[PDB]
């Protein structure tokens, strides 16, 4: 799936850079372009992608400091300059557009829905939001920003693929290492999903999986491959289970309307019975009547299952997240 990335805010520009960097290093070429939009000048200066600074007449290049409503207003006023960065960038070859944002911030939170709603109303391709959910320890302000933002993008975007920061943690890590590690894991997951269509899993399988709308999740897990395909039947079953149950970008995302199961690895090592049974298992676990599947042939000593879940519902993490956010607002209104 050939795509155009637009980061909004600091986290968004960082994740958008990591994804483009993954696509470039591997040579997949799925990312046709990447642009970062922000209101903090310093954030933009460090990024290796095209950058657009907006809002200087309001906040003088120093960000909106977690003010969601200021983040939205600036994107409203300055969207033409944003859209115009995309003129020569959203080419004809684009099969989708990802608006990448941290939902808890001010700029991404405010600007992402605005830009998503603007793009969705003109381009023929799907507009997706790759949205970062704040960790549960983050301040009430960030929970509230994300709550409102998530609600808005879930209506305006064609789908919202969610990344839970709390899902990607390593003991002992520094603050910046943590963020980079999250971005890098997301980049590999999303990049492979985008690359599968470029060869074999048609890009249309991704589109039809996300077509239902609302929240999506992306699962990943891998295992060493034996050269003999028959030895890898268990490996395919278990990576697929892990991808759906533990390795998902949003925790507890099993209950989904649609799914796409991609088994990646060397063709000779991928067993027929493993793949068939793994897909059937996903269908039983999700309850979905729209489980699609395909294989991604690539050089590796391993096998992996990459499972996209579209129309995710009844996720404990999402429900917990919305619950605390509403409690912050209730407490704030007094």
């Amino acid at each position: 799936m050939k795509t155009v990335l637009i980061g909004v805010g600091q986290a968004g520009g960082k994740l958008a850079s990591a994804l483009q960097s993954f696509d470039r290093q591997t040579g997949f070429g799925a990312v046709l372009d990447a642009v970062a939009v922000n209101t903090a000048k310093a954030d933009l200066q460090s990024l290796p992608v095209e950058t657009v600074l907006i809002g200087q007449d309001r906040v003088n290049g120093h960000g909106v400091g977690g003010d969601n409503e200021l983040g939205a207003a600036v994107m409203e006023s300055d969207q033409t300059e944003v859209m115009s960065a995309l003129d020569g960038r959203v080419t004809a070859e684009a099969e989708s557009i990802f608006v990448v944002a941290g939902l808890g911030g001010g700029s991404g939170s405010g600007g992402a829905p605005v830009l998503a709603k603007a793009l969705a109303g003109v381009y023929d391709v799907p507009v997706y939001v790759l949205g970062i959910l704040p960790g549960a320890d983050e301040g009430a302000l960030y929970q509230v920003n994300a709550g409102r933002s998530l609600k808005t993008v879930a209506r305006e975007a064609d789908a919202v693929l969610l990344v839970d920061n709390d899902a990607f943690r390593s003991a002992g890590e520094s603050m910046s290492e943590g963020y980079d590690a999250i971005n890098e894991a997301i980049a590999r997951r999303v990049g492979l999903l985008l690359a599968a269509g470029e060869a074999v899993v048609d890009t249309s399988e991704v589109i039809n999986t996300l077509r239902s709308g609302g929240i999506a999740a992306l699962g990943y897990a891998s295992a060493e491959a034996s050269p003999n395909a028959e030895d890898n039947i268990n490996a395919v079953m278990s990576t697929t289970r892990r991808a759906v149950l533990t390795g998902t970008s949003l925790p507890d995302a099993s209950d989904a309307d649609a799914a796409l199961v991609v088994i990646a690895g060397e063709p000779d090592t991928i067993p027929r019975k493993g793949v068939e049974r793994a897909r059937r298992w996903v269908e039983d676990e999700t309850g979905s009547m729209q489980v699609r599947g395909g294989d991604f042939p690539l050089e590796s000593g391993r096998l992996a299952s990459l499972v996209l879940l579209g129309g995710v519902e009844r996720s404990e993490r999402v429900e917990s997240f919305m619950e605390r956010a509403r409690e912050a607002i209730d407490k704030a209104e007094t």
Binding site: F28, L298, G301
Partner: peptide, 13 residues
């Protein structure tokens, strides 16, 4: 098949 230049496994850890 997508062939890998460089020593890092695409599906590595």
């Amino acid at each position: 098949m997508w062939h890998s230049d460089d020593l890092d496994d695409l599906l590595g850890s």
